[PDB]
Design a binder for this molecule. Structure first.
Ligand SMILES: Cc1cc(C(N)=O)ccc1-c1[nH]c(C)c2c1CCCCC2=O
Length: 131
């Protein structure tokens, strides 16, 4: 019940619930799929954003088991909000929406206790490099 596999199954379920609540939050539809430069009238998006990321890209990596640490899931989610704060002007609707979901995501990490999984990840790496 306390095995490393039980914890690894836990934060995979917490991340899967997190990426669902982000997809359902207000304005979350603008981060679900990757930006189609032609349909959204942004021909220079991938000339500025070189590491694109969307909710669908994170759901796929969760389904294929491509996250080794719980901190890697947060980095992909934060990358979405970082690409949003970069390409979009600070007073644009998208940038405001991105900041609102960013706060929601960070507060959901507190409520769900996901951060405690990242801390134990760091301690385990310490108690492993010491041997
Ligand atoms: C993909 C997308 C879809 C819709 C939709 N179909 O409702 C609305 C907005 C956006 C969107 N998402 C991001 C992440 C952005 C944009 C708009 C373009 C500027 C780049 C940017 O930050």
């Amino acid at each position: 019940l306390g095995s490393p596999e039980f914890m690894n199954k836990q934060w995979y379920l917490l991340a899967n619930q997190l990426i669902l609540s982000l997809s359902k939050y207000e304005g979350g539809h603008i981060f679900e799929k990757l930006v189609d430069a032609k349909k959204q009238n942004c021909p220079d998006y991938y000339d500025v954003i070189k590491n694109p990321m969307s909710f669908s890209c994170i759901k796929t990596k969760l389904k294929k088991g491509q996250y080794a640490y719980p901190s890697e899931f947060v980095k992909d989610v934060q990358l979405i909000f970082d690409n949003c704060s970069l390409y979009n002007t600070s007073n644009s609707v998208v940038a405001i929406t991105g900041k609102n979901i960013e706060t929601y995501f960070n507060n959901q990490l507190i409520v769900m206790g996901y951060n405690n999984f990242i801390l134990k990840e760091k301690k385990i790496n310490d108690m492993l490099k010491l041997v």
